[PDB]
């Protein structure tokens, strides 16, 4: 809205989880630079009083900082004048059974802000608008229902007078949808489902007019057999982006359900789709299905980054994105045209490649999944070559700094019934390091990409997956947190490590930055969890447990324990 744009345009403020409408997650603050980064030290800290993964990052508006925790989703307001004191706090009352329906740790990706309001959700399905000054609740509505396996985890997105919010639960057969709510009243504007009729999917009259081959009308029913689409998945629990000139918003819908591909023949549209939808009506202008008939849980919800760059000399309005499938995608954001569809790592084997003319992946049958068969050495794993991390872009060098995962798996499905409110997966996996690490044990990488060619400038290896993302600050640094507990700073130029600090616990969010009384600060949540840490936060031992994850991160315990908090740094 207007208030949001004011904060957006105020230097050193941080009112959007993603960095700005365009989600480049970067910053113009240049107080900390490659030449004085060595001198950065911890400034202050704050504990949330909750355990489990602490994803997201705090918000800064004016001289206030809003922090959030894992379930049960507490919110704390702090005047930067005095971090020692908690101006207001919001502590929801939520039934513990909510946790039983959250697939991947009881996480929360953050808060939103609009119209002098802090917008926050609860895992249990509620969404509220609280005065940013006093914490008084303005409106509170139900969005999802935990009884059918639907919960909330993503950060709300505010644009104009609307708040976008989608529920989680594809692992429990939840049919995904983006819900748009009135910022001032919390009344529902519309809802755009990822499956079913075009009316429910909300497709505009000219949907895919520039790329008829992507598919158009009647496919959210026609690419399924019978009623399977009703519990067809496609939840969007990732990040959003917005182009104010075009009035379009972008996001990816998730994986189809069950995981057992044999139980849902069909392209399963419009799951695994990148969207360009009108903000006011919610009608799709374009739709690109990245992964027809997913056989690997490559949920397509990753962050969307909008950039304006020259392609073959023509300045083009772009959308870039790294999917779980291991493909870096660049499209024209106005029309959905596909420009780049490249492997982020040579180990990607589910596809031989993506045909720019057909616009679909050329499948390698050797790495497919199917009943009565055990697929091995599949890359990427369900966890993907990229997950929920929030990457950064340097507008000057025109590079994206990506936190990738380097994990592969074995998989074999099994038949199961669907019962509402109960898990609907149907697969057994074993996950392990991919093949390219230097000692062949590394599962993370910081990779610098050119978005117009999809070529890597440099690579930095990490023992563990680079789950949270990176931050780019004009001083020429790429900042990130590791699962083993360090916040790091690299030279954007060659990825060389210039600084680091050992935080109490692993970080699974992306770092943020702000100004306060002339000094730039760096903030980072801490507290391992999310999918990588379920073995640790739940004390699992079965390698097969935690959807295959436990076996893969078994050594994380020797480096970190749970936590819950924020650490702020500066010069």
């Amino acid at each position: 809205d207007a208030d949001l744009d004011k904060q957006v345009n105020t230097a050193g403020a941080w009112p959007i989880a993603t960095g700005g409408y365009y989600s480049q997650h970067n910053s113009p603050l240049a107080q900390i630079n490659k030449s004085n980064v060595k001198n950065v030290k911890a400034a202050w800290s704050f504990s949330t009083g909750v355990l489990n993964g602490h994803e997201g990052a705090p918000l800064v508006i004016g001289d206030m900082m809003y922090v959030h925790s894992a379930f049960p989703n507490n919110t704390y307001a702090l005047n930067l004048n005095d971090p020692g004191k908690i101006v207001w706090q919001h502590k929801p009352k939520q039934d513990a059974s909510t946790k039983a329906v959250m697939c991947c740790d009881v996480v929360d990706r953050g808060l939103a802000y609009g119209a002098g309001q802090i917008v926050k959700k609860q895992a249990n399905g509620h969404l509220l608008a609280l005065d940013a000054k006093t914490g008084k609740i303005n409106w509170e509505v139900e969005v999802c229902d935990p009884k059918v396996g639907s919960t909330l985890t993503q950060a709300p997105f505010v644009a104009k007078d609307t708040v976008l919010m989608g529920c989680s639960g594809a692992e429990l057969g939840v049919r995904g949808a983006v819900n748009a709510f009135d910022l001032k009243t919390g009344e529902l504007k519309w809802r755009a489902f990822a499956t079913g009729s075009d009316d429910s999917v909300r497709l505009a009259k000219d949907f895919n007019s520039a790329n008829p081959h992507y598919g158009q009308f009647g496919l959210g029913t026609k690419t399924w057999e019978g009623d399977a689409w009703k519990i067809g998945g496609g939840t969007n629990w990732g990040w959003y982006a917005y182009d104010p000139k075009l009035n379009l918003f972008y996001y990816g819908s998730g994986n189809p359900a069950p995981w057992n591909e044999t139980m849902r023949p069909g392209d399963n549209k419009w799951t695994m789709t990148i969207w360009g939808r009108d903000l006011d009506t919610g009608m799709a202008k374009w739709g690109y299905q990245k992964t027809p008939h997913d056989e690997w849980d490559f949920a397509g919800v990753n962050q969307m980054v909008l950039t304006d760059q020259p392609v073959n000399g023509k300045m083009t309005p772009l959308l870039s994105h790294i999917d779980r499938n291991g493909i870096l995608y660049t499209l024209n954001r106005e029309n959905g045209n596909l420009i780049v569809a490249e492997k982020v790592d040579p180990a990607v084997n589910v596809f031989k490649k993506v045909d720019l003319k057909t616009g679909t992946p050329v499948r390698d049958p050797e790495f497919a999944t199917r009943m009565d068969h055990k697929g091995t050495n599949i890359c990427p794993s369900a966890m993907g070559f990229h997950n929920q991390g929030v990457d950064s872009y340097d507008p000057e060098s025109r590079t994206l700094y990506a936190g990738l995962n380097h994990i592969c798996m074995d998989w074999e499905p099994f038949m199961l019934p669907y019962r509402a409110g109960q898990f609907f997966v149907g697969a057994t996996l074993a996950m392990y390091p991919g093949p390219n690490g230097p000692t062949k044990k590394e599962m993370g990488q910081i990779r610098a990409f050119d978005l117009t060619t999809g070529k890597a400038k440099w690579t930095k290896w990490e023992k563990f997956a680079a789950w949270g993302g990176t931050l780019y600050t004009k001083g020429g640094l790429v900042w990130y947190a590791t699962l083993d507990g360090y916040l790091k700073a690299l030279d954007n130029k060659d990825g060389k490590e210039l600084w680091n600090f050992k935080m109490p616990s692993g970080g699974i969010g992306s770092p943020m930055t702000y100004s306060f009384k002339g000094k730039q600060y760096i903030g980072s949540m801490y507290g391992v969890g999310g999918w990588p840490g379920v073995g640790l936060v739940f004390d699992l031992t079965d390698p097969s447990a935690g959807l295959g994850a436990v076996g893969a991160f078994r050594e994380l315990q020797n480096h970190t324990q749970m936590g819950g908090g924020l650490m702020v740094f500066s010069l």
Binding site: P212, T223, D267, P292, P417
Partner: protein
């Protein structure tokens, strides 16, 4: 099944060798229970009603309250 053989635009699915073209009636028939399949819609429906009662309930007084009937 390479993904390249399309029946029509946006529909390129093919059965893998030895798997049925249609699942219904096969050894892979999911045999979904319609009563189960309709739960989400019913739930949404009920939720919408409750929420609509709340915004109205306070658009007329000027004080949000969640508890409604």
């Amino acid at each position: 099944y390479d993904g390249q053989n399309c029946k029509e635009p946006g529909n390129c699915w093919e059965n893998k060798p030895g798997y049925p073209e249609k699942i219904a009636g096969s050894k892979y028939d999911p045999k979904h229970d319609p009563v189960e399949l309709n739960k989400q819609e019913e739930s949404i429906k009920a939720m919408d009603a409750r929420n609509a009662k709340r915004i109205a309930n306070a658009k007329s007084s000027g004080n949000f309250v969640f508890d409604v009937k």
